[PDB]
Amino acid sequence: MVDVSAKAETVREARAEAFVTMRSETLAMIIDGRHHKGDVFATARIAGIQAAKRTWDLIPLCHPLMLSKVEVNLQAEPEHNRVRIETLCRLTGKTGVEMEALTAASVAALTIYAMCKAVQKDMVIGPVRLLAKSKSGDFK
Amino acid sequence: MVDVSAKAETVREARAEAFVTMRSETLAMIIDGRHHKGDVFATARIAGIQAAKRTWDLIPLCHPLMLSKVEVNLQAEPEHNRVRIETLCRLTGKTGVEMEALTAASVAALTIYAMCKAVQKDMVIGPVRLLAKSKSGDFK
Amino acid sequence: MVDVSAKAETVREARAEAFVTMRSETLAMIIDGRHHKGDVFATARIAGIQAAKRTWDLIPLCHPLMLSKVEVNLQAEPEHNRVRIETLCRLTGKTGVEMEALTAASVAALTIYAMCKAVQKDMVIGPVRLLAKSKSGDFK
Amino acid sequence: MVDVSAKAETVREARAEAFVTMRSETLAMIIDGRHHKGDVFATARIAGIQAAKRTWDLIPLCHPLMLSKVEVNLQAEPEHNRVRIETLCRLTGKTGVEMEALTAASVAALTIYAMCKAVQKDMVIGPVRLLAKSKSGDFK
Amino acid sequence: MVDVSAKAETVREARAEAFVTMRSETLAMIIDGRHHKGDVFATARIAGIQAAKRTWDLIPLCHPLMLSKVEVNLQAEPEHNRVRIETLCRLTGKTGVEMEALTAASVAALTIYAMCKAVQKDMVIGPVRLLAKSKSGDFK
Amino acid sequence: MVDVSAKAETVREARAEAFVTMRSETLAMIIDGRHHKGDVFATARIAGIQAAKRTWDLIPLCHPLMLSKVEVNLQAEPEHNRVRIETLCRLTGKTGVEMEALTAASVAALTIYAMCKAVQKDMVIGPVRLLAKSKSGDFK
């Protein structure tokens, strides 16, 4: 891992997104679903937040850090037969938080899949990519 | 999590795959790359194996288990501008290993991305899906 | 830790309970609450399940094990100004699961407290005790 | 979890307490006990200190942080048939340490229980509450 | 990691040893020391037991497993100016426990060092080696 | 653990070293070895870096911290029949990084041993000691 003690101190931020594609009946169960007993979206939200706080433990050369805010948003899209996962991570440090946002969106997607495993076996996860990161200024 | 003490004991197995898409110059650095100093493929292999052994800690309702074998294979495909990650997990128990194989392929893909972060910012991960799992007998 | 390789193999089980006492207005927010956005009960359920799977990592002389089933049930009791947390853990092994059930009820109670921290500062947790465990046969 | 990058920088502190109630003979073994071979108090002290450093990993929406000081004090009270656990946590940051102090007292109490499991099965843990926290200034 | 599902089931065992060398005054403090407040030997014993249970998480290609018994023994040797750490690990499985015993002796040695850091800076750890392991039958 | 909020803020650094002694044929396999498929040195490097980031989780009274740079260097020495492991850790904080450097060198040494287990059973690890640390100014 590269030294980070030199350039430092600013408000760093990143937003990532992930998708889980599935059948309509599978998506119907999730939606009907929410606000009940074992809400798939709520479980996935929690897992995503725990995952981002463990990013340095999963990616060998990532640097440990204090996240100040982590947000995992889920949205069902019946029109395209899939779930959209949007994440946001923020902190104040020397290094950015792009791996933390991607990691939360990936483990959220993996949790959705885990909970729908018994119904549909051919669900696909992807794509998983960044949306923004702030001398970089990456937006849209 | 659902009880698993009833149906049990057999050779369970699963294979998963993941893709990281990038520019040609980015892929050129990785390849040239290997067998040198900070081999991106070697790092990613290791991370993937550690990730699969932590699957129960990341996915809230997964069950803890003894993996007997975990294999993470990487292959560069200059033709399609991307890396192919193929994983394989095996054990002998009551539950299957589909989440362990998907988790190893996802964290391997995340490690490739982490190490190429400074060069290309718009790399895409996906798709991430299963290939096989064995009363199920899921092949191809 | 005492050796466990001798006496072994059976269906072990335990049930534990915990209580969080608070003001009526505090309990009113939780209840109104559920099935919405950041459901306190759902968060606490998840944390409790993750905690039980990490029991050997928190209690120095506990033995690692494969839990087959973990259940965290929450119930609001406006009559006594508090939340009742009931847990259940099961497995098939040489050792019992009393520490796993107590640990899930304690971290569930701690999560309820964490999420209500800003409102009421004098909330009390307790008691935390066992209800059953099965040559022991401990019931009621 | 709520953003913490705004209000920040001060000496934060909290003190928590926990109780384990048991039979006189059970308490007699612990006391007689100490300064010997497998000192129950020493084990519990250690576990409590490790638990507080893992608080963000157990409570889903807690924020990671650098504790500067963690103290777990145990005191046997034959008069009331129980052990008193008193904890203290300190750091310098944006967020307080109330969950870290409560978590150390709870896992210390759980370790005392674990080690006395074979003797008495009806030991009770509780109450578990805060004593102080420092614009808050919560004392006594 | 190599597959282990084939050859399996037996009582596996291993014993390891480690040494910390130091000045006489440093060793005098440790000894005088024990059975008091922050017993260096007791802390080191605990850490060693937690380390062995995390061996699969530290050594990338080790296999997860259920240890049934872990023992960390410390003995002060004023004659040679050092501490002797002896460990023992046991289980019933397909794989041996040589890495678990070496890992517990190494982290015990590291804990002794940590606690004596402020006094002597040139303490040396070593050697760290195996003593026995049981178709192998390695003794003495 | 001792409070660290008082004296603070500087560039802290430490370098540690470890040795694994083995037969010539064993060392020959490792060397021939590198830049191939399951490079022993690469695996050991990775493990060492993950270990240093977990030091506070293994040594009970160590303080959590943000490492800014961790370096694990391996060098084969056929002349003395062994591997030399040299580590370097850096950060900017109140506490030093001597335990982080020793911990990375110890787990790197343990990984080398793990991977050569099947060939030679009497390999020895040691010594494990510090080389430098910076009001201290410890060099050579």
From Swiss-Prot, chains A, B, C, D, E, F:
One of its GO terms (cellular component) is protein-containing complex. Homohexamer; trimer of dimers. The active site is at 114. Gene3D superfamilies: Molybdopterin cofactor biosynthesis C (MoaC) domain. It comes from Escherichia coli (strain K12). InterPro entries: MoaC, MoaC_bact/euk, MoaC_sf, MoCo_biosynth_MoaA/MoaC, Mopterin_CF_biosynth-C_dom. Its EC number is 4.6.1.17. The keyword Lyase applies. It comes from the Bacteria. It is an enzyme of class 4 (lyase). GO terms for biological process: Mo-molybdopterin cofactor biosynthetic process. The keyword Lyase applies. Changing residue 62 to A: Reduced activity. Keywords: Lyase, Molybdenum cofactor biosynthesis. Belongs to the MoaC family. Catalyzes the conversion of (8S)-3',8-cyclo-7,8-dihydroguanosine 5'-triphosphate to cyclic pyranopterin monophosphate (cPMP). It catalyses: (8S)-3',8-cyclo-7,8-dihydroguanosine 5'-triphosphate = cyclic pyranopterin phosphate + diphosphate. Pathway: Cofactor biosynthesis; molybdopterin biosynthesis. This is Cyclic pyranopterin monophosphate synthase. Induction: By anaerobiosis, repressed by the molybdenum cofactor. One of its GO terms (molecular function) is identical protein binding. Substrate binds at residues 61-63, 99-100. SUPFAM superfamilies: Molybdenum cofactor biosynthesis protein C, MoaC.
